[PDB]
Structures are given as structure tokens and as C-alpha cells.
Design a binder for these strands. Sequence first.
DNA 1: GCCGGTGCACCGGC
DNA 2: GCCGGTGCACCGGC
Lengths: 249, 246
Amino acid sequence: SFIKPIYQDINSILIGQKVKRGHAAGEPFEKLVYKFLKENLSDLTFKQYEYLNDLFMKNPAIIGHEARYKLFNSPTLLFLLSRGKAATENWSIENLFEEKQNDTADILLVKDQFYELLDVKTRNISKSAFAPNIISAYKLAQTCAKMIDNKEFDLFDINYLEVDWELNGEDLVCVSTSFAELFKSEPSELYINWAAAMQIQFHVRDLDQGFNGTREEWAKSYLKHFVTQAEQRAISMIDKFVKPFKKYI
Amino acid sequence: SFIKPIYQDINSILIGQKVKRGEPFEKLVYKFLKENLSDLTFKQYEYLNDLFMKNPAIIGHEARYKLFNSPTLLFLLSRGKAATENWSIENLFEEKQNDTADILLVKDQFYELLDVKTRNISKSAFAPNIISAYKLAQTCAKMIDNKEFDLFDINYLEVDWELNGEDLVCVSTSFAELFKSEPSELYINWAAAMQIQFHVRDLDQGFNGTREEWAKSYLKHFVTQAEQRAISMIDKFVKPFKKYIL
DNA sequence: GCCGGTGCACCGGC
DNA sequence: GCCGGTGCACCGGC
Ligand SMILES: [Ca+2]
Ligand SMILES: [Ca+2]
Ligand code: NA
């Protein structure tokens, strides 16, 4: 992690910060995070969309999607970070990618052909804990599937940054942060909430970090968990959404 | 319905309406209604606030809940046990992401729940989440259990807008009623928080049959659809990944 | 045309 | 403590 070694810097400058008072979060702190990481690690840090523009700017020779897709040099990273075929082809120097809500990552750090996908989960601390959607389980499955096919086991990490806040009035105030790597958690202990867009849910400060095996072992362990859980859900649908209503019909 | 009678008016006013750089067209819809039907028009939180101030004696959740005198409307409209419990005049209800409705219109003990759908028509059509299919099945169930078949309607107002400048402008609107649609035609997208999806303008409004019949039809449709999904998952999320784990 | 997966967190039952 | 359903709509493959 390019971040972990400065968690303390990060945490020191956030606690406070004070932002000013639908499907937006409630916290602009993510912006505050980026600003910092961009500030201090300026060579390594980008919004997902910014990284793609820069990727494309640096290769004007390459027009059209199939070719701009070869600019990733990685089926798995292609999968996580790229926009659709049409948008990529229409990519133009004077027509750049903007923020898409659907983008896999919030911030993204890259040094030496290795990627840290960083997702910030903000969280109102005054309220009753509700584990937020972390990332599609189904996306992660394909992601894992893709690592194994392409033996890309030493390419990227997907990490999370929890920033907690409350309302002293007028302004929101950050009161604490947490940082966790996903590929250091025990895969079989990941909560897949199917109904909630098939998302993994957890709080970052609650997240297991004692996986000891290899990345590859992680990916295979995750697929086993995923497949196990999909079978659970299917079975669980009958008693949950079928049995209780048959009386009426 | 309460707004259909003057829907044309609502439609002519909304077009041309501009909002600065489109979820807040919902506000305009609300302003217009409050101004044209002020005694009928409430935000969900507003209606609950108005009910509970009228009965300042009736404190606590159990007692407040009895205030609805309808197990169905209790279900679509109320807040949690602690929430109602800690309700105060100095601590009133506020907006809540997953409250059922955007706007409530009511008169003579009859309820029209109105969910406004904003749509960026600039961008290629993506059928929006309408309501939870599961919350709908429960609704139908209770509708049946307590024989509440003439109490409330769940209607939608599509508000189409585009990025016409430094801000957004409404270009058109549509108005459909859930209970007029064909139950077995409704698209349940299970992954998407199990949400029924559609474009108001695309919804059929021809259902021949009583409200009770609708509820039963939907329940047939839901139960059925659930079963299909059970199996769809093994093909989608189990078969395609078994290779990596043998 | 047809189809359905994803980002944002977020509440309340027992 | 455990657990999981709900609202916002919103793209891109073929
Ligand atoms: Ca985020
Ligand atoms: Ca709405
Ligand atoms: Na809705």
C-alpha cells in the first residue's frame, strides 16, 4: 500500500477538516482525502476518470477502443477501471472522461505498474451502524476469476478508507478514520448482502486483516465463498419470498 | 386520484421550470401541489409530524402506531419503534432516504402515495427502480388480510429534464398508476434491491379487475418470479465459477 | 431493442 | 449483537 505508510499523516490532517452542511453520501470528505493524497503524493494519485484521460493523452497515436484497451496491458485492470467501448472510442483530447457514479474506484494510486484501488466509505457516527455497500460481490467474483485466468496475482490491491464524522451543527466534522486492505481479510468471513445490489458489506474498522496465504489462494478462497453463498441465497429465496405468500394464491 | 384531475395544469407548469446545476425537480412538484392543494399535500415526514402533534397526549410507539388505524398504511408510512418513541415537537421527523413516498396526497381517509421519478432524457434510457417488489408483496398481502382494497393508490410522476445550460430544465412529464398496470407485466430486477423497474410513460394502464384481484395477480407474479430467480442464480453465479474451485 | 448489474450509504427488528 | 431490506436513478453489451 502506498497509503498505509502514511495513515498517520492522513489521520492527523483529517480529524477536524470540517466540511459545510437522493443518492449522494453526505460526506465531501472523499474530496478532502483526494486533495491531500494529490497534494503530497502528486505523482501517484488520480481520480479514476483522471487516470484514464492521462493514459489516453500520453498516447495520441492510439485512436479507437480496441486499441486504447490495449493501453491497459491487463484484462483484469481493463475490467475494473475502463469505460465502455463507445465512450472510449469517442474519447477525445477535447472530450475527456468525467466522473461516473458507477466507477469502481474513488481514488487510485499507481507506482511502478502496480495499482492501489482506494474506496472511501464516509459514515455518520451519530447514527446507528449500518454496514455500507463495499463492492459488488459479483464484480469481485469476475475480478478474481480474471486474476486466475491471467495469473495477474501481483498487480493491484483494493483498499478501503473509512472516515467518520458527526454534526456539531452547521458543519460536519471528521472525528476518526480507519484503513483496511481487502485482500488481507478472510474471504469466507465477508458478508454478501444479495438484496443490496449483491454487495459486500462491512465497516472498515471492523474488517478482518489476518489472511496469511497468497493472493492466488485468496482469489480461489473468495470464489468458493461466493459460489457457496449464491447457493444459500437461492435456497433462501423460497422460504423468504415464496412460502410466505402462497396462501394468497 | 387527486392530481390527475389537474394533471394537465401540472404538466404545463413543470415544463420550462429550471433548476441550477435532477432529483430536486421533486421540490417543484411539491411546491406546485402545496400551492394548488395545500390541505391535501404532505411530505411523508410532514404527514407523520401533523398526526402526532394533534395527539400530544398519545406518547410512545405502540400508542402512536394505533393512530394510523390501518395495518397497510402503518406499513408504508411509519418510522421505526424508537423513532416514533423519541418523537418530540422539539425533535420532529425529517427526511429519510428510504421512506416509501415523496409526496402524500390525502382527503376523506383516502391516500395517494406519489413517487416522482426524475429522468435525464439526454442519456440513454435506463428503467429506474420504482418500488421494492418485496415491499409490494407485503403490501398486497396486508391489503388482502385486512380487506383494505379501496384505501390508497401508489402512483408515479415522471419528470423529464435535460442539461440546457448552466442548469437543468424540465422538457416533459408522464403520470401512471401502479394499480392500473398489468401485475404480471411488471419487471422485477432482483439484483437492484429487488426493485420493480419501469418508465412511467411505458407503463400500461388498462388493468380490468378489482384492487383485490390486482393484489392476488401480483402475488402470483412475485412468487413465480422469485422461483425463477432461485434457479437463475445457480446458472449465473454458481455454474460460471465452479471451474476455479474444483 | 432487449436486458439487468452498480455506485452512494443508510435503519431498525428481536 | 445479528442481521438484511430501501431509497436515488443510472449504461452498455450484443
Ligand atoms: Ca465511496
Ligand atoms: Ca423519487
Ligand atoms: Na421509488
